[PDB]
Prior knowledge:
This is part of a larger assembly, with one copy of chain A, two copies of chain B and one copy of chain D.
Chain A: E1 3-9, H1 10-28, H2 42-45, E2 51-54, E3 58-61, E4 63-67, H3 71-77, E5 90-92, H4 101-106, H5 108-125, E6 130-138, H6 143-158, E7 163-170, H7 181-195, E8 198-203, H8 204-214, H9 222-241, H10 250-257, E9 265-271, H11 286-294, E10 310-319, H12 323-336, E11 349-354, E12 363-371, H13 375-389, H14 396-399, H15 405-427
Helix pairs in contact in A: 1-6, 1-9, 5-6, 6-7, 7-13, 7-15, 8-9, 11-12, 13-15
Chain B: H1 2-26
Chain D: H1 2-11, H2 15-23, H3 38-45, H4 48-56, H5 71-77, H6 81-89, H7 104-111, H8 114-122, H9 137-145, E1 148-153
Amino acid sequence: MREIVHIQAGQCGNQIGAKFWEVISDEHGIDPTGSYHGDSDLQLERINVYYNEATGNKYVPRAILVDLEPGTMDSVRSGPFGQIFRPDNFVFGQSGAGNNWAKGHYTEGAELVDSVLDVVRKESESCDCLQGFQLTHSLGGGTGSGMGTLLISKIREEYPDRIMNTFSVMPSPKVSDTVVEPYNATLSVHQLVENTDETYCIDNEALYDICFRTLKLTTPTYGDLNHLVSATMSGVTTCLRFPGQLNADLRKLAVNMVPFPRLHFFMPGFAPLTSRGSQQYRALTVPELTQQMFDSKNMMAACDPRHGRYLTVAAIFRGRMSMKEVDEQMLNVQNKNSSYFVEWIPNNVKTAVCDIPPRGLKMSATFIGNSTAIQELFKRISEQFTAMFRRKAFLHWYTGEGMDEMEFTEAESNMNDLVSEYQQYQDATAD
Amino acid sequence: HFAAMLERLQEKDKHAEEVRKNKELKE
Amino acid sequence: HFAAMLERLQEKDKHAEEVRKNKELKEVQIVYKPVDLS
Amino acid sequence: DLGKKLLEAARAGQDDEVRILMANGADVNAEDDSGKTPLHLAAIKGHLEIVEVLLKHGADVNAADKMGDTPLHLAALYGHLEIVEVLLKNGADVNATDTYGFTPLHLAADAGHLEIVEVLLKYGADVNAQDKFGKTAFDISIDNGGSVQIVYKPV
Ligand SMILES: Nc1nc2c(ncn2[C@@H]2O[C@H](COP(=O)(O)OP(=O)(O)O)[C@@H](O)[C@H]2O)c(=O)[nH]1
């Protein structure tokens, strides 16, 4: 029954992974003990995608929790829903990665990886028909970045015919001052380009700017940043968790969204944007929903969608609304904004509508775009990487772990190639 | 196609063992 | 038959590099020849 | 309360907001969750005028965070030469040591900022200073940086 295995690695991966489970649990009527208490049958129809049914009619997330930082286990277990997670699915080390990709990928991470693979093997074999995997992690640290990409690679060896999907948090010096974050992110992107089928680019630069400029928060905290992350993750997974026709599984989503294998980095967006504690006085109209979710101020990646073209788009509308009005509005943005949509992929914008809205909203909309403007995110990381790399800055922290400088050169070149490929398709014409 | 992908992934594994051995040479 | 023999000899080579690497874990070259008659 | 506001403005490069907070009596040595003062933040982010204003208003030039890093260590680590020069001209300790035994010279050499390594050395930085890993600053830059001979002998 199309099961997904969820994996959360590192401090960021576990923080956003926990919020994902707290949020989707509420939507499905599942309390922290695993009991169901809802009104709608749509809540449990596809509960199997993310939850295992344990004895006593309980539901337990098909989630594996990983971190080299031992202290992460306590913070996850102490969360509102820490009780729901399978105890044996918590795999924690004693020595962290110290913001070092090489430690997470090659040394401390490699020491712990077989313990994680044992637990993913067990969840995977228990599946009636496994779809693939979903990894939440950051790219700026050491565990989520290095060990997360090591896990992806090992999982790909045993399950090569399954979808590998990630929620990858991109670093921004606006939220983190760690000097080596561009190194860790470039090394991770190199891995993601080769080994994932679809990746959602949750950019800390866009999240900080949404909180500061749009939500008017003088100093956004990780809670503020993560409110946007969970709201995004709920929206982008709605099609997988509820009964529907379009993009109902990770494979059908990838066939619709990815025309060229490497070009699988999605720009997520949502509407209405809200802060924690902001009440909704009235529901947005379908034209407000459609206009806002396509707005650059609503994107979760710091890229201007009007600086590129949309290869493909998935629009998900949640709540009770007119489908005729939705269709009209979706045709309206494409006909009015025709120059930001590739003309050589006919009917590249697919729209789904789910009757169940998210918490505190009567109407909402989530956007998923595969845009050539995503090169703005990669160019920003590449520039930061190059500034340090030309000075051979901080390399001993990586080569001291056994790494070769040639790996940095290879990763830089691969990400720069990815950027040229987006530009090639942006300039392509339907001759 | 799957065998080519596996060969590529297994070469990453040989490389990882080389990295681990290289660290050992230093300390 | 000759390919099997060569494969066996080439495994001795891989082994020799492992031995050399093992010494390194624990802890350029002059070649002398005499003067020619000519 | 004004200490939190002063730290946000120092990090965000708001020159006029810092000037206003200073006039309204904010604590120059207010610390963030990591023991960093507004001077550490302006040094990390490279806001020279904010550094000059903070120093002029009595900020501790050798203030250390919970990791033992002074504004000089962070100016060196983040490659801000002018800030390093201002801090030095204002009494910064060139031989300041952090939890790892790194001095500002160690961080400048790791960052690949040879111009900062030079100004630190001209201000008296110890070239033999070793970190807790037994490494000098130049050992770090070297670490970062990454046949047969036929001899005819008469008999
Ligand atoms: N959005 C978001 N970013 C986070 C969070 N925690 C850490 N990060 C980012 O992740 C990076 C550091 O990676 P982290 O997950 O802390 O490291 P790891 O434990 O070694 O994987 C930096 O870019 C942080 O800003 C979080 O809760 N939310």
